Amino acid sequence: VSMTKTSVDCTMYICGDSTECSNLLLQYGSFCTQLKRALTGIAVEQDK
Amino acid sequence: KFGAISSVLNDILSRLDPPEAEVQIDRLITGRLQSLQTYVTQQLIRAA
Amino acid sequence: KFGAISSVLNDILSRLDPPEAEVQIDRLITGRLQSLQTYVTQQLIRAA
Amino acid sequence: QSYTNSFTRGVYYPDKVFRSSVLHLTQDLFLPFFSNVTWFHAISGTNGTKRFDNPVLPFNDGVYFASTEKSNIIRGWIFGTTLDSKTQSLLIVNNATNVFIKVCEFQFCNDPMESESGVYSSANNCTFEYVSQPFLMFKNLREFVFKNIDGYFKIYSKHTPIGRDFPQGFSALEPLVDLPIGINITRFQTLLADYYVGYLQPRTFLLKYNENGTITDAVDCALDPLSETKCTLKSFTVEKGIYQTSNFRVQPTESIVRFPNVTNLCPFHEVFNATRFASVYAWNRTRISNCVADYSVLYNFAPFFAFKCYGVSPTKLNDLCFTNVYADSFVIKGNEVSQIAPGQTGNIADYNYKLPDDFTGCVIAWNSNKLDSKHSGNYDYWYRSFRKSKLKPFERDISTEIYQAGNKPCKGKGPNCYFPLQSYGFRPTYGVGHQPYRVVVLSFELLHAPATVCGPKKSTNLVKN
Amino acid sequence: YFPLQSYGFRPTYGVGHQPYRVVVLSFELLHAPATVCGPKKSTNLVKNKCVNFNFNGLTGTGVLTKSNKKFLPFQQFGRDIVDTTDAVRDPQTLEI
Amino acid sequence: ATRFASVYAWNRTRISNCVADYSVLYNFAPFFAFKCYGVSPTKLNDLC
Numbered sequence: 001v002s003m004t005k006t007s008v009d010c011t012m013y014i015c016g017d018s019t020e021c022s023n024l025l026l027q028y029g030s031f032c033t034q035l036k037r038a039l040t041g042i043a044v045e046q047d048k
Numbered sequence: 049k050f051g052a053i054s055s056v057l058n059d060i061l062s063r064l065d066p067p068e069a070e071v072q073i074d075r076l077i078t079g080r081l082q083s084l085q086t087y088v089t090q091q092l093i094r095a096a
Numbered sequence: 097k098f099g100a101i102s103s104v105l106n107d108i109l110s111r112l113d114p115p116e117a118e119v120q121i122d123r124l125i126t127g128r129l130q131s132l133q134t135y136v137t138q139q140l141i142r143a144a
Numbered sequence: 145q146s147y148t149n150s151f152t153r154g155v156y157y158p159d160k161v162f163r164s165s166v167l168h169l170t171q172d173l174f175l176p177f178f179s180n181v182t183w184f185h186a187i188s189g190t191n192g193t194k195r196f197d198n199p200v201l202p203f204n205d206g207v208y209f210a211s212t213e214k215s216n217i218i219r220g221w222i223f224g225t226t227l228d229s230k231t232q233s234l235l236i237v238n239n240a241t242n243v244f245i246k247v248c249e250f251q252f253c254n255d256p257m258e259s260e261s262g263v264y265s266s267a268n269n270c271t272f273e274y275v276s277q278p279f280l281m282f283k284n285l286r287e288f289v290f291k292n293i294d295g296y297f298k299i300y301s302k303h304t305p306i307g308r309d310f311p312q313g314f315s316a317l318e319p320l321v322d323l324p325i326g327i328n329i330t331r332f333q334t335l336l337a338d339y340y341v342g343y344l345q346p347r348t349f350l351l352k353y354n355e356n357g358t359i360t361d362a363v364d365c366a367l368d369p370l371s372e373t374k375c376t377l378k379s380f381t382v383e384k385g386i387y388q389t390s391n392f393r394v395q396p397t398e399s400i401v402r403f404p405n406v407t408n409l410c411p412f413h414e415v416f417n418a419t420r421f422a423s424v425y426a427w428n429r430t431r432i433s434n435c436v437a438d439y440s441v442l443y444n445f446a447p448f449f450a451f452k453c454y455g456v457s458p459t460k461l462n463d464l465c466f467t468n469v470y471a472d473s474f475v476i477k478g479n480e481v482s483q484i485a486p487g488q489t490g491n492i493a494d495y496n497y498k499l500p501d502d503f504t505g506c507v508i509a510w511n512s513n514k515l516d517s518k519h520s521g522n523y524d525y526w527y528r529s530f531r532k533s534k535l536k537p538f539e540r541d542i543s544t545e546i547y548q549a550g551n552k553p554c555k556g557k558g559p560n561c562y563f564p565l566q567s568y569g570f571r572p573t574y575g576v577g578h579q580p581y582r583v584v585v586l587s588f589e590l591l592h593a594p595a596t597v598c599g600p601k602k603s604t605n606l607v608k609n
Numbered sequence: 610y611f612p613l614q615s616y617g618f619r620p621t622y623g624v625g626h627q628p629y630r631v632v633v634l635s636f637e638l639l640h641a642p643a644t645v646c647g648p649k650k651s652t653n654l655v656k657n658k659c660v661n662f663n664f665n666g667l668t669g670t671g672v673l674t675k676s677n678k679k680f681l682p683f684q685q686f687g688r689d690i691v692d693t694t695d696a697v698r699d700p701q702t703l704e705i
Numbered sequence: 706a707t708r709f710a711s712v713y714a715w716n717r718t719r720i721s722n723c724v725a726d727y728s729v730l731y732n733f734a735p736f737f738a739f740k741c742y743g744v745s746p747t748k749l750n751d752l753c
């Protein structure tokens with residue numbers, strides 16, 4: 001009926017505790033936001 | 049490592065000057081971002 | 097070619113010594129990784 | 145006083161792009177909302193310290209100024225570093241009819257009653273002048289933002305009808321001037337013939353544009369969780385529900401540095417300051433262990449022909465620990481320095497000393513002509529010009545067999561064979577390409593810290609939990 | 610020996626002797642943003658046709674038409690909701 | 706060659722129906738530069 005719900009913080013996974021890496025990651029646009037939306041949608045779908 | 053000299057960002061920043069750290073970090077950013085997109089894609093398929 | 101001088105790994109290894117051959121090979125690896133990942137992702141959707 | 149709430153003050157147009165009925169989320173240097181703004185009525189208000197002294201304030205990344213004065217008592221600013229004619233500085237002074245902006249080497253100004261003032265003192269070596277750029281610049285709040293980005297000095301300003309001190313409200317500062325000053329601005333000073341200063345920090349703001357391109361409101365994404373939610377959604381209206389915002393982390397409170405009891409210094413002095421150096425053929429490898437990797441002595445010892453590090457680009461080698469350190473010492477010709485690197489070829493790289501293609505370490509080349517050259521020629525250095533095969537990385541080949549040039553055995557030297565070791569003398573009369581140079585390659589293996597060759601750092605007390 | 614003797618003002622006709630004015634230009638090209646650069650030629654404005662354009666460094670391809678947008682005095686160009694340029698201020702006439 | 710051509714008139718010599726051995730190139734001089742594109746030096750002793 002349901003799947004384990006997860007949420008992944010893009011910045012911590014790719015650039016954990018790294019300011020320079022985070023600043024570089026900002027140059028790739030909305031990708032982190034798109035993954036956050038995808039995982040949120042999955043979590044809501046599992047509760048539905 | 050995804051082609052980088054080290055998998056640990058703190059070693060890249062402590063070992064290399066910014067102009068080289070940006071290259072090694074960019075390689076790691078590409079690898080980790082690809083890993084998250086692959087994960088999210090499989091989770092969307094499993095969610096369906 | 098995905099940006100490489102040649103699509104054939106044997107030609108890259110024959111023509112260049114490791115310091116650049118590894119770079120040209122890394123580009124061919126990256127391109128083929130994207131090709132295989134796209135193929136499998138679409139096969140998973142089609143299989144569903 | 146000397147602090148104030150500030151409210152929603154100090155927003156400026158981050159760029160020159162027209163937008164219509166959109167919300168634009170941007171990261172730039174802004175004065176945070178409800179941050180503390182320094183009020184200088186105390187200390188340097190009214191007469192204040194005028195005619196005797198005045199403190200100088202820091203310029204950290206950029207500044208926000210405000211004043212409610214209409215008397216034009218406040219006349220200008222100086223931006224720069226030393227501000228004593230030693231270096232360049234930028235001086236902006238207002239007048240009744242014009243504006244005088246000059247960047248030159250300024251020593252001091254007549255402006256640190258008021259029948260005559262501002263004749264200035266002395267200046268020289270001036271670089272740029274700008275005159276009447278904006279021509280001019282019931283109380284009037286006069287807001288300014290001064291920002292220095294990649295050599296461009298950006299000035300923004302706004303006049304708001306005001307008698308309240310920073311009344312509640314919102315007004316964006318339009319850009320006023322953009323100067324190619326090209327200098328370094330670490331400190332600034334005000335000039336008097338009431339005044340507020342806020343400091344900008346990098347922050348993300350959501351700016352609301354109307355149909356006519358004017359910014360009418362803004363959200364400071366870090367002010368409170370509601371503002372952060374608004375920025376996440378890029379809306380000034382938030383629907384009922386739960387929204388996910390940025391993750392939280394617990395920050396560290398102190399730095400813990402732990403090193404072994406070793407206080408011995410690595411013997412770089414003895415290897416680099418040796419009175420006699422090995423040839424390239426019998427190049428000398430000394431292992432460095434159980435010592436402090438202090439490289440300050442290397443920069444103090446002498447200037448070098450080349451100091452090129454592969455895999456560790458900085459000269460700041462004192463912050464790393466090593467697991468396997470070797471110093472390979474040899475004497476080469478200047479024209480061969482370029483051959484001692486991964487991927488290089490030639491008689492030295494091919495037959496006397498070769499680095500691995502994944503080499504990590506530093507190649508240090510010092511001009512040693514005054515020590516190694518001789519009038520008769522120093523024949524104690526002997527490259528192997530002729531070898532049957534190419535040398536392997538870090539291989540030491542000390543064979544003395546006579547090389548035979550092909551099929552003929554040619555035992556002995558001459559008819560079709562050469563003794564592989566070829567002497568070439570060094571003499572004070574040779575040019576820089578032939579003069580002897582001492583090269584030491586420091587091979588650094590970096591694989592975490594199983595073993596210690598750590599640099600000159602101090603240990604602190606251990607703190608747990 | 611003095612540098613102040615007149616040397617070559619007198620014609621003293623020879624190819625060697627005739628004075629020549631020599632002016633040299635350093636072309637320093639320092640790090641600080643350059644304020645000196647040659648004049649950039651402009652070309653007549655074409656509207657209601659598909660053209661390539663370069664407006665004060667902003668380049669693109671499109672059809673230029675009279676706009677009803679009202680830019681603030683300092684704004685040089687505009688962008689739509691997805692940050693793609695959709696309007697410019699002509700650097701010579703200030704028409705939007 | 707005793708004489709090299711001026712840069713306005715580079716001398717193009719065609720080499721064909723021959724075999725190459727590159728140790729002679731090292732024998733001719735110490736070099737200011739020997740930069741190869743698309744192939745690394747010392748790999749030219751294969752078909753080049």
Ligand SMILES: *[C@@H]1O[C@H](CO)[C@@H](O[C@@H]2O[C@H](CO)[C@@H](O)[C@H](O)[C@H]2NC(C)=O)[C@H](O)[C@H]1NC(C)=O
Pocket residue numbers: 700701702703
């Ligand atoms: C310089 O720019 C100004 C406006 O910024 C131009 O002035 C107008 O030019 C048009 C056409 O030439 C005239 O019809 C207007 O009457 C002018 N305005 C004024 C106030 O004189 C000017 O022509 C431009 N100069 C050049 C050489 O292109």
Ligand SMILES: *[C@@H]1O[C@H](CO)[C@@H](O)[C@H](O)[C@H]1NC(C)=O
Pocket residue numbers: 326327328
């Ligand atoms: C600013 O300071 C740096 C410090 O290294 C210096 O290199 C640079 O030239 C300075 N720029 C100026 C004074 O414009």
Ligand SMILES: *[C@@H]1O[C@H](CO)[C@@H](O)[C@H](O)[C@H]1NC(C)=O
Pocket residue numbers: 354355356679
């Ligand atoms: C925008 O400008 C037009 C110009 O006619 C004016 O009518 C309108 O009221 C203005 N709107 C705002 C919000 O300033």
Ligand SMILES: *[C@@H]1O[C@H](CO)[C@@H](O)[C@H](O)[C@H]1NC(C)=O
Pocket residue numbers: 413414417418419
């Ligand atoms: C180090 O070099 C100096 C010359 O700069 C010399 O006087 C001194 O004796 C040398 N020390 C050793 C141990 O070689």
Ligand SMILES: *[C@@H]1O[C@H](CO)[C@@H](O)[C@H](O)[C@H]1NC(C)=O
Pocket residue numbers: 421422426428429430
């Ligand atoms: C190499 O250096 C060490 C340093 O102590 C020295 O003892 C050794 O004799 C040297 N060997 C040669 C061949 O120079």
Ligand SMILES: *[C@@H]1O[C@H](CO)[C@@H](O)[C@H](O)[C@H]1NC(C)=O
Pocket residue numbers: 708709710716717718
């Ligand atoms: C170019 O080299 C060839 C080699 O055979 C020679 O015959 C020819 O004359 C040369 N031309 C010039 C202009 O040097």
